[PDB]
Amino acid sequence: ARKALIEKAKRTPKFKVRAYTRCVRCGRARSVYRFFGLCRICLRELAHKGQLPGVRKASW
Amino acid sequence: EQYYGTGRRKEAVARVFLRPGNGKVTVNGQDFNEYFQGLVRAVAALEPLRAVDALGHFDAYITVRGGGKSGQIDAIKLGIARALVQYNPDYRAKLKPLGFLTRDARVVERKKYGKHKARRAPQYSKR
Amino acid sequence: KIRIKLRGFDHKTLDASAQKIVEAARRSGAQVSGPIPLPTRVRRFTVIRGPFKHKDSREHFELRTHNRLVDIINPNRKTIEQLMTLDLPTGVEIEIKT
Amino acid sequence: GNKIHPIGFRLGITRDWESRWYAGKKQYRHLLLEDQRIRGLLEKELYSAGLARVDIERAADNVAVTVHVAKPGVVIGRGGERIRVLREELAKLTGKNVALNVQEVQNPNLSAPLVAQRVAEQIERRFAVRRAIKQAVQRVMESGAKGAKVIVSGRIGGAEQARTEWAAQGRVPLHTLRANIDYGFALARTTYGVLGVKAYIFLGEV
Amino acid sequence: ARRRRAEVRQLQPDLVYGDVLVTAFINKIMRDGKKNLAARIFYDACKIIQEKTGQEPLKVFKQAVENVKPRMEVRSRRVGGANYQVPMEVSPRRQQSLALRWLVQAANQRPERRAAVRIAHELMDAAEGKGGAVKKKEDVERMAEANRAYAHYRW
Amino acid sequence: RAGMPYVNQRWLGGMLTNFKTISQRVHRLEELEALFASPEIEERPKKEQVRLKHELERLQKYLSGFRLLKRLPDAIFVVDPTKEAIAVREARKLFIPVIALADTDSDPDLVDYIIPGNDDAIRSIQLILSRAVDLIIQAR
RNA sequence: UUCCCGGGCCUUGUACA
RNA sequence: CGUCGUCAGCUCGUGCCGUGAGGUGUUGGGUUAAGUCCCGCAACGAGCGCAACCCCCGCCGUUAGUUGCCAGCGGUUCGG
Numbered sequence: 001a002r003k004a005l006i007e008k009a010k011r012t013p014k015f016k017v018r019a020y021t022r023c024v025r026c027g028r029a030r031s032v033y034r035f036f037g038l039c040r041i042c043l044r045e046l047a048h049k050g051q052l053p054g055v056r057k058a059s060w
Numbered sequence: 061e062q063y064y065g066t067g068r069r070k071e072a073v074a075r076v077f078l079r080p081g082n083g084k085v086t087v088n089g090q091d092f093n094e095y096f097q098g099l100v101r102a103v104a105a106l107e108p109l110r111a112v113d114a115l116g117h118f119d120a121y122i123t124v125r126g127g128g129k130s131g132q133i134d135a136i137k138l139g140i141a142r143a144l145v146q147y148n149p150d151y152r153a154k155l156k157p158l159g160f161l162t163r164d165a166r167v168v169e170r171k172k173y174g175k176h177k178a179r180r181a182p183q184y185s186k187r
Numbered sequence: 188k189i190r191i192k193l194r195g196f197d198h199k200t201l202d203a204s205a206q207k208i209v210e211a212a213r214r215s216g217a218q219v220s221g222p223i224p225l226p227t228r229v230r231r232f233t234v235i236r237g238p239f240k241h242k243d244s245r246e247h248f249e250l251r252t253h254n255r256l257v258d259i260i261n262p263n264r265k266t267i268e269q270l271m272t273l274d275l276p277t278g279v280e281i282e283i284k285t
Numbered sequence: 286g287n288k289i290h291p292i293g294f295r296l297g298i299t300r301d302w303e304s305r306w307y308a309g310k311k312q313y314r315h316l317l318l319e320d321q322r323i324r325g326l327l328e329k330e331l332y333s334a335g336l337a338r339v340d341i342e343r344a345a346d347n348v349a350v351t352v353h354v355a356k357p358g359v360v361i362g363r364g365g366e367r368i369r370v371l372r373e374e375l376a377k378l379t380g381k382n383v384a385l386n387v388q389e390v391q392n393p394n395l396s397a398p399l400v401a402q403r404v405a406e407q408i409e410r411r412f413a414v415r416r417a418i419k420q421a422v423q424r425v426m427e428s429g430a431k432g433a434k435v436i437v438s439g440r441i442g443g444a445e446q447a448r449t450e451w452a453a454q455g456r457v458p459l460h461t462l463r464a465n466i467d468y469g470f471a472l473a474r475t476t477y478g479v480l481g482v483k484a485y486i487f488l489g490e491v
Numbered sequence: 492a493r494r495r496r497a498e499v500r501q502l503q504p505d506l507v508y509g510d511v512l513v514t515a516f517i518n519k520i521m522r523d524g525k526k527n528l529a530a531r532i533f534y535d536a537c538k539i540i541q542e543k544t545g546q547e548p549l550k551v552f553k554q555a556v557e558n559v560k561p562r563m564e565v566r567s568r569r570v571g572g573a574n575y576q577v578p579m580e581v582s583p584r585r586q587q588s589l590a591l592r593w594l595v596q597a598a599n600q601r602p603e604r605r606a607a608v609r610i611a612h613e614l615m616d617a618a619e620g621k622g623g624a625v626k627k628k629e630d631v632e633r634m635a636e637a638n639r640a641y642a643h644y645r646w
Numbered sequence: 647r648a649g650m651p652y653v654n655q656r657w658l659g660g661m662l663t664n665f666k667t668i669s670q671r672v673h674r675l676e677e678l679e680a681l682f683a684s685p686e687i688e689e690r691p692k693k694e695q696v697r698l699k700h701e702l703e704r705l706q707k708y709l710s711g712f713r714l715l716k717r718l719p720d721a722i723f724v725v726d727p728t729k730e731a732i733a734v735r736e737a738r739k740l741f742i743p744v745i746a747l748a749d750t751d752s753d754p755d756l757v758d759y760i761i762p763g764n765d766d767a768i769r770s771i772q773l774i775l776s777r778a779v780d781l782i783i784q785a786r
Numbered sequence: 787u788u789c790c791c792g793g794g795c796c797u798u799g800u801a802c803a
Numbered sequence: 804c805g806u807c808g809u810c811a812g813c814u815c816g817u818g819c820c821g822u823g824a825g826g827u828g829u830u831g832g833g834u835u836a837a838g839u840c841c842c843g844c845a846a847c848g849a850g851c852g853c854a855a856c857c858c859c860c861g862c863c864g865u866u867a868g869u870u871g872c873c874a875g876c877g878g879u880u881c882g883g
């Protein structure tokens with residue numbers, strides 16, 4: 001999550017297959033979610049904070 | 061004319077209509093012998109009838125949905141018991157002891173994280 | 188002849204909005220089909236609790252959206268003028284259909 | 286131990302989301318990202334004001350920001366200069382003609398975030414940690430507040446070793462769903478590291 | 492089980508014959524949750540028995556089971572760092588369990604190709620008073636009564 | 647048969663040295679007694695009512711008669727000084743004069759005003775207490 | 787519930803920066 | 804975040820005991836999944852825990868009938 005990598009991720013990389021996704025909050029490139037654009041850790045933090053509307057702890 | 065019972069067992073749901081007749085049962089527009097064919101256990105679905113010396117009086121229309129064949133059989137059994145009770149409350153006094161008015165509450169237990177399937181833990185060795 | 192589709196993350200506000208719409212419509216002449224509860228859609232996210240390891244923690248989150256139906260029949264002119272003008276709570280979304 | 290977030294635990298009941306709006310699969314992440322930007326900007330801007338909570342709402346291409354502040358005077362400025370400049374700043378941050386709204390919190394001693402922020406200020410000003418926590422808890426408990434509990438992380442007073450301080454008074458039943466427990470976190474940046482301040486305030490039942 | 496007595500499950504009586512012992516035997520046959528297969532195998536074996544033997548298959552099965560019920564078992568016990576096979580009397584429950592399990596194992600160990608054939612043969616032989624099941628019962632009994640020296644370890 | 651308080655079920659440790667703490671229990675008793683006289687009990691599901699009633703009856707059992715003490719008593723009357731040695735010790739500690747109906751197995755030193763008599767024999771207790779109470783009555 | 791492992795209680799001999 | 808451990812335990816205010824560390828409460832007997840409850844007791848109460856409050860499955864009810872259902876009932880021709 002070097003600054004250079006974060007910036008490089010946001011340009012048209014001369015190809016489609018060179019494109020990938022990063023956590024829009026911390027720049028993590030590993031375990032992001034398409035729906036939110038957040039990594040797992042940031043997903044958990046923001047879901048606990050109550051800043052993700054309609055999202056709650058599940059129990060079935 | 062029509063005496064109706066529901067019955068439920070493990071994702072299978074029945075609807076039984078009992079009408080006066082010769083004692084012929086149909087399931088989803090098919091016959092019992094041809095729907096549950098090759099299944100030994102099938103005839104179980106009819107014990108609540110023959111418990112009270114039925115099978116001479118009531119033709120049954122059966123609509124069954126969801127679950128599996130065995131679950132469907134149990135649903136049919138519960139439905140028939142309920143319909144017979146509705147026919148005459150006194151029937152309840154003799155159906156209930158034999159254990160037919162009970163809906164089996166046992167269903168598939170949900171999987172747990174960190175287990176192979178809901179109870180089975182991962183193997184470990186070489187302590 | 189005119190169809191109202193209601194979406195929302197919450198069910199309280201969704202029910203309140205559905206009741207308000209159906210009441211305003213029924214009071215305005217034409218008959219109402221009423222609030223039909225459509226099946227809700229649930230998305231499940233399972234995320235490891237720990238930031239580094241311990242892959243056996245796996246907190247579960249769900250996001251559920253509810254769906255309603257109203258389906259007003261024989262649209263009155265005063266009805267069609269009162270609709271598309273009502274104010275919604277912060278969560279509820281309305282889709283219009285014919 | 287590893288207690289879970291007492292707000293996430295009660296999002297369903299006794300607590301409400303900070304953001305209330307619906308979005309489809311297509312437009313969820315964009316709305317969320319701009320919300321993140323808005324919260325970041327206001328947090329940076331309105332620190333002096335005593336910010337406690339930010340609420341974002343959307344109806345139809347409209348944003349209704351509601352900011353709960355100890356001192357609304359700081360937010361407005363004189364003749365509504367500051368509020369207007371903030372409104373235009375937000376509008377040009379996100380092109381959705383936002384509507385900034387200001388609320389004043391009654392008895393800021395009953396606001397968990399404000400209490401945590403105040404204690405963090407005390408820490409950054411090199412006050413006695415134990416005395417600060419004790420005074421904060423006493424002050425909170427004096428203003429009703431059926432229960433209170435304040436925790437400070439570690440590295441107390443430029444020490445070599447980290448250690449949790451922590452003080453409580455009253456009832457803090459974390460395990461009950463119908464608790465209406467208010468939680469606040471503050472980060473104190475000291476020349477010798479960082480400290481965490483957690484505040485729990487138990488305000489009635491049901 | 493440290494506290495309770497672990498009450499035995501009540502099995503649903505058979506449908507063809509209306510007895511619980513047949514149900515237990517079917518269960519003892521059934522593998523991988525295939526119960527229909529076990530029922531078909533058992534009924535094929537019963538038909539074979541009836542076709543090749545005078546009386547009803549039910550009596551043959553029942554009296555074979557009664558014929559393969561041991562009474563003395565040896566249990567491994569630790570005394571003074573030594574392992575002793577203490578003789579014990581087996582309750583009817585354990586009797587029936589051992590009988591059915593041994594019958595099934597002996598049937599499955601036969602050289603006949605078809606499962607129904609093997610089951611029928613084992614049942615007929617155990618009825619007569621010979622075969623793998625009866626032999627194992629006899630060996631179990633003789634392993635006891637040959638070490639009655641340790642019976643005073645009441646256990 | 648007087649305005650005097652009494653303890654006859656059990657002497658809780660610190661009825662005198664820890665007077666303030668026990669007074670809280672007295673207040674709890676009065677508040678619960680008020681609550682069960684109210685129709686507002688219909689909330690708090692029946693088993694919660696059960697536990698509340700158990701608490702109330704325990705309080706009545708141990709604190710009936712003790713309810714009359716608004717403050718520290720001016721004297722104490724002990725039937726058996728040996729039996730209620732805890733009460734005697736407390737009263738000694740708090741400079742409260744002690745009157746006791748002692749017998750052969752008692753310590754004469756710890757009693758300020760001793761009546762050398764019997765601690766058993768209902769008749770003796772009846773006579774002594776009756777005379778004392780009548781004297782209190784006609785003294786008022 | 788005799789033995790294998792672990793935890794708790796009652797009773798008991800050595801060591802805790 | 805893992806772990807001991809979903810194991811039942813960890814403390815506090817006033818009182819009492821001991822010069823003091825500390826003890827009692829929280830040692831005893833019955834019963835619990837549980838410091839769960841009861842009885843006694845120099846202690847009387849409380850806080851964090853346990854349990855409950857929240858959710859899912861199992862029975863029934865009111866509200867509502869579309870894109871879901873078809874017991875009635877009129878063509879169908881297989882098809883709700």
Ligand SMILES: [Zn+2]
Nearest residue numbers: 023026039042
């Ligand atoms: Zn992230």
